[PDB]
Amino acid sequence: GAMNSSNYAELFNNDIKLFVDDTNVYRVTVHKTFEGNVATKAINGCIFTLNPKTGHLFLKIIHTSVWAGQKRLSQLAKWKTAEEVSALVRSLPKEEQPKQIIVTRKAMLDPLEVHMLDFPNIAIRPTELRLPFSAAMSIDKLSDVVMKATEPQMVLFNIYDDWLDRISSYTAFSRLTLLLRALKTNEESAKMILLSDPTITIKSYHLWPSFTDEQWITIESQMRDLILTEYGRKYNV
Amino acid sequence: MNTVPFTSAPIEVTIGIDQYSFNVKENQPFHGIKDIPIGHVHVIHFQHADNSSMRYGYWFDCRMGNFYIQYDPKDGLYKMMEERDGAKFENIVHNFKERQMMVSYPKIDEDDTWYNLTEFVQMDKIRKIVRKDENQFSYVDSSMTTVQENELSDPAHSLNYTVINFKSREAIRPGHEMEDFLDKSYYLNTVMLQGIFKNSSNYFGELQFAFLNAMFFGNYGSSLQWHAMIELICSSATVPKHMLDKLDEILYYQIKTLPEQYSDILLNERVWNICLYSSFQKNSLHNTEKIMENKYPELL
């Protein structure tokens, strides 16, 4: 069934499961042509596929060449996502294949269902949560590797850095979503909060700064404050 | 012209014969239906005064033998049976006609309705969908479930319609996922028409048979089946031109014949709106679309 606030803790059990987010797969800039008509130019995108329990991120980069000479690209984009996710799962050892794939957008159910026909025991599920994975291109290192790519490419990250060394998955996911929620609501403020202190650096093999436990607390509070301020501004409340 | 005699009518029952129907009273001297047109299948069906639930009946074809109806007070229903003694049977039918205790199949000569609805229905195919090979006629009722329904209990009493499933390996060639899901021509033309049904007539026949069982028995799985077969055609980019023209005729009479008060359970909104207005064949059902809009504009 659908994933929602009720059955949220299932994300962190020992059933392998992956989130799939397709919001950044087909990315364009919109511009004016010489004759004054509008045209799009695609830029590289990505599939955001994530084990919420372990933080393993499979960032399949979608090179603009994929789109060459194809029509109805937004629709294509959903099948290419399905195609790449299915190929991912087939690439994995059996004991690593997910028991569930949760799509962040319901338009992906049919394409993933069709492409997983060979895995009838992998449940494809929608979710009611409003997850912020579209802000994944607000993470500098993820955006850099997408935009530099010159060909289809898979890049693996752990999106929790070394956090699980010290905190549970539930906590790790809540931090992640809080950070991406913030990046999504006001990227400039969110990023200022993260980097204001030159003395807290990002390890070469990490996405986020090496905050101590106490500094994470301060950071999370600042992100929370950010999100609420922006809400009041959005709705004049 | 053929005859289906009834031994008696012990219980008050609504009797249908094709699209026609009569009220018969408890132990009314009713002894059958005469002047039934040869050349088509027919269905004789019942709804007891006391149980407006379970509509039931018998598909049959009089070329295949002498059939009659007899009430069973143990099993509580009007049963179709076959008389093997041709002389004994003409004798019953003659005596009852003499006594004038039979209703006449009330066909208007102008009317092609029943032909139109049964054009491709053949008794031999019905008996594969309703498997009971000891009888030449086929029983169906409101509650019988289909094979596809069963997979998602008693196989003897199932409707063995061809299973159509848009999200299945059968429907989708590995490597043509998007193509084949978005454009079911492959599934229709190769898998179903060339593979299983062999020709469009058999395809249309199951379709009309499914429609008829839904209309006459409110058999839900048959409704499901009808919509599935329509949707498969309408969601194929490439359909023989002769099939499209015939489909438009098929559906028109089916829509024409549906009871107005039943359009709410018998017509799947999604399928019809998709078929008429979104599908590849949105422009190929002119008559079906015209009759749907004028008679059921709400559903759309």
Interface test with A, best of B165, B172, B178, B182 (most A CBs within 10 A): B178
Question: Chain A residue closest to B169 (CA)?
Answer: A117
Q: Are both A43 and A79 inside the same structural domain?
A: yes
- Which of the listed residues A99, A132, A163 is the one where a domain comes to its end? A163
Left (φ > 0), alpha (ψ -120 to 50) or beta: where does B56 sit?
beta
Write the CB contacts of A7 (distance below 8 Å, at least 6 apart in sequence): A1
d(CA A226, CA A230): 6
Q: Are both A31 and A119 inside the same structural domain?
A: yes
Q: Are both A173 and A78 inside the same structural domain?
A: no
Interface touch B167/A111, C-beta < 8 Å: no
d(CA A89, CA A101): 10
Find chain B residues with C-beta within 8 A of A117's C-beta. 167-169, 172
Tell me which long-range contacts A144-147 makes (C-beta under 8 A, separation of at least 24): A145/A59, A145/A61, A146/A24, A146/A44, A146/A45, A146/A46, A146/A59, A146/A61, A147/A43, A147/A44
Nearest Cα residue to B57 out of B289, B294, B217, B214: B217
Strand pairing of A45-50 and B2-5?
unpaired
Helices and strands per DSSP (H, E), number in chain A: 6, 8
Q: Are both A138 and A187 inside the same structural domain?
A: no
Asked whether residue A70 is domain-assigned, the answer is: yes
Which method was it determined by? X-ray
Question: Chain B residue closest to A115 (CA)?
Answer: B177
- In this complex, the residue of A76, A83, A114 whose CB is nearest that of residue B167 is A114
Q: Is some CB atom of chain B closer than 8 A to the CB atom of A87?
A: no
- Judged on CB neighbours under 10 Å (0-12, 13-18, 19+), A214 is exposed
For residue B288, CA distances in Å to A140, A161, B11, B211 come to 57, 61, 40, 15
Pairs of CB atoms within 8 A across A/B: 23
Q: Helix (H, G, I), strand (E, B), or coil: what is residue A29?
A: strand
Question: Chain B residue closest to A114 (CA)?
Answer: B167
Interface test with B, best of A117, A118, A119, A122 (most B CBs within 10 A): A117
- Could you list the residue range(s) of the whole structural domain that residue A99 is in? 9-163
Asked whether residue A2 is domain-assigned, the answer is: no
Asked whether residue A63 is domain-assigned, the answer is: yes
Interface touch B167/A117, C-beta < 8 Å: yes
- Angle at CA of residue B47, ends B41 and B50, nearest 5°: 170
d(CA A161, CA A54): 10
Q: What is the 3-state secondary structure (H, E, C) of chain B?
A: CEEEEECCCCCCEEEEECCEEEEECCCCCCCEEEEECCCCCEEEEEEECCCCCCCEEEEECHHHCEEEEEEECCCCEEEEEEECCHHHHHHHHHHHHHHCCCEECCCCCCCCHHHHHHCCCCHHHHHHHCCCCCCCCEEEECCCCEHHHHHCCCHHHCECCCCCCCCCCCCCCCCCHHHHHHCCHHHHHHHHHHHHHCCHHHHHHHHHHHHHHHHHHCCHHHHHHHHHHHHHHHCCCCCCHHHHHHHHHHHHHHHHHCCHHHHHHHCCHHHHHHHHHHCCCCCCCHHHHHHHHHHCCCCC
Q: Are both A132 and A205 inside the same structural domain?
A: no
- Which of the listed residues A163, A191, A208 is the one where a domain comes to its end? A163
Query: Could you identify the residue written with the tokens 């399928």?
Result: B271
Asked whether residue A1 is domain-assigned, the answer is: no
Contact B115, B257 (CB under 8 A): no
Q: Are both A137 and A234 inside the same structural domain?
A: no
The CATH code of the domain that includes A212 is 1.20.80.40
DSSP string, A92-127: S-GGGS-SEEEESSGGGHHHHHHHTTT-TTSEEE-B
Q: At what angle do helices B220-234 and B200-217 cross, to 10 degrees?
A: 140
d(CA B210, CA B118): 11
Asked whether residue A198 is domain-assigned, the answer is: yes
d(CA B122, CA B40): 8
Q: At what angle do helices A187-195 and A169-185 cross, to 10 degrees?
A: 130
Q: Are both A92 and A154 inside the same structural domain?
A: yes
d(CA A43, CA A63): 8
Domains detected in chain B: 1-143 (2.60.34.20), 144-300 (1.25.40.550)
- In this complex, the residue of A76, A83, A117 whose CB is nearest that of residue B172 is A117
d(CA B215, CA A232): 57
Find chain B residues with C-beta within 8 A of A115's C-beta. 177
Contact A103, A20 (CB under 8 A): yes
Q: Are both A111 and A85 inside the same structural domain?
A: yes
- Which of the listed residues A147, A163, A179 is the one where a domain comes to its end? A163
Find chain A residues with C-beta within 8 A of B178's C-beta. 76, 79, 111, 114
Question: Chain B residue closest to A87 (CA)?
Answer: B175
The CATH code of the domain that includes A97 is 3.30.420.230
Name the domain count of chain A: 2
Question: Chain A residue closest to B168 (CA)?
Answer: A117
Asked whether residue A136 is domain-assigned, the answer is: yes
Q: Is some CB atom of chain A closer than 8 A to the CB atom of B178?
A: yes
Q: Are both A219 and A112 inside the same structural domain?
A: no
Report the gap between the CA of B13 and the closest CA in chain A (Å). Answer: 46
Asked whether residue A19 is domain-assigned, the answer is: yes
Q: Are both A58 and A174 inside the same structural domain?
A: no
Q: Helix (H, G, I), strand (E, B), or coil: what is residue A58?
A: strand
Q: A124 pairs with which residues across the strands?
A: A101
Q: Which two tokens stand for residue B18?
A: 């094709």
Please state the separation of Cα B156 from the chain's center in Å. Answer: 19
Interface touch A82/B167, C-beta < 8 Å: no
Asked whether residue A4 is domain-assigned, the answer is: no
Q: Are both A146 and A201 inside the same structural domain?
A: no
Q: Are both A142 and A174 inside the same structural domain?
A: no
Q: Which two tokens stand for residue B272?
A: 């019809």
